[PDB]
Amino acid sequence: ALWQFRSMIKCAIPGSHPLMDFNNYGCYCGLGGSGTPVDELDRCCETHDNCYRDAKNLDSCKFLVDNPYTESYSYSCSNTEITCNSKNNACEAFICNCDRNAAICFSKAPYNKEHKNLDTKKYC
Amino acid sequence: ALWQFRSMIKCAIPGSHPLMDFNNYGCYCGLGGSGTPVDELDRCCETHDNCYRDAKNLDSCKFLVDNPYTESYSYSCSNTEITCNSKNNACEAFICNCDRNAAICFSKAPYNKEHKNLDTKKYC
Numbered sequence: 368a369l370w371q372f373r374s375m376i377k378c379a380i381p382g383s384h385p386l387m388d389f390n391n392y393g394c395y396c397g398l399g400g401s402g403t404p405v406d407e408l409d410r411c412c413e414t415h416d417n418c419y420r421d422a423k424n425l426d427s428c429k430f431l432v433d434n435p436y437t438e439s440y441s442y443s444c445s446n447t448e449i450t451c452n453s454k455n456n457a458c459e460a461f462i463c464n465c466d467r468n469a470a471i472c473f474s475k476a477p478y479n480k481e482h483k484n485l486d487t488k489k490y491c
Numbered sequence: 492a493l494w495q496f497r498s499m500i501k502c503a504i505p506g507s508h509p510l511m512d513f514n515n516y517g518c519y520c521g522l523g524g525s526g527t528p529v530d531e532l533d534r535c536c537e538t539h540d541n542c543y544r545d546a547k548n549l550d551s552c553k554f555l556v557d558n559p560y561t562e563s564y565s566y567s568c569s570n571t572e573i574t575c576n577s578k579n580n581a582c583e584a585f586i587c588n589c590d591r592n593a594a595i596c597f598s599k600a601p602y603n604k605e606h607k608n609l610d611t612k613k614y615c
């Protein structure tokens with residue numbers, strides 16, 4: 368679920384404020400997305416976006432209000448190491464791994480100040 | 492989800508082994524249930540059973556494999572105080588509260604050794 372992802376990011380990047388850092392970054396860090404990502408970072412967000420598309424597109428999973436973000440899963444974070452509980456059901460595990468992969472991904476992308484609050488209708 | 496309930500019980504009753512204590516107790520502590528509960532304790536289990544029936548019977552909720560037990564929610568336990576995260580979605584919150592109410596309930600029922608592994612086909 369949304370909040371758990373915010374705190375996955377804080378886990379992988381301790382010195383960080385997710386909502387402020389990774390919302391409206393580039394073309395795909397934020398609601399929806401368009402165009403080609405501008406970045407490794409923005410790429411991590413596009414993949415996450417696509418990861419939520421696949422889960423949405425699994426017959427077995429019927430998310431609340433149709434938004435995988437609504438789906439709480441249960442993880443743990445020991446010193447920059449995210450772990451998705453194995454006892455997550457299949458849909459929760461899939462959502463969990465989208466978030467985790469994205470947090471691992473953000474930890475390793477370069478952050479370019481330039482692309483925070485990008486003019487999306489010009490560059491995306 | 493099942494495992495979270497097991498650890499809700501350990502939270503409310505610290506000196507306890509849930510799987511061993513509350514599985515096949517009386518008529519309703521364990522898979523399904525029949526007849527009238529024998530106990531306060533067994534009553535707590537019947538109510539839980541019924542609580543999972545109501546959730547199952549909410550149009551908005553479509554559980555995996557159709558079993559609310561499959562649904563992970565996110566709670567916290569500070570010294571015999573269960574707290575269901577408010578950021579649980581509606582179905583997770585409902586499941587959460589069934590488990591919590593049942594753990595609070597078990598903590599306060601008398602435990603009668605007599606009714607562990609009851610002969611259900613005679614007394615239930």
Ligand SMILES: COC1=CC(=O)C=CC1=O
Pocket residue numbers: 373385386389390396397398412
């Ligand atoms: C909705 O997009 C995001 C929100 C956050 O809080 C953190 C990262 C995101 O990508």
Ligand SMILES: COC1=CC(=O)C=CC1=O
Pocket residue numbers: 497509510513514520521522536
């Ligand atoms: C399935 O019934 C139960 C299993 C547990 O582990 C603990 C309590 C129960 O009622």
Ligand SMILES: [Ca+2]
Pocket residue numbers: 395396397398399400412416
């Ligand atoms: Ca996006």
Ligand SMILES: [Ca+2]
Pocket residue numbers: 519520521522523524536540
């Ligand atoms: Ca039962």
Ligand SMILES: [Ca+2]
Pocket residue numbers: 438439440459562563564583
């Ligand atoms: Ca869940």
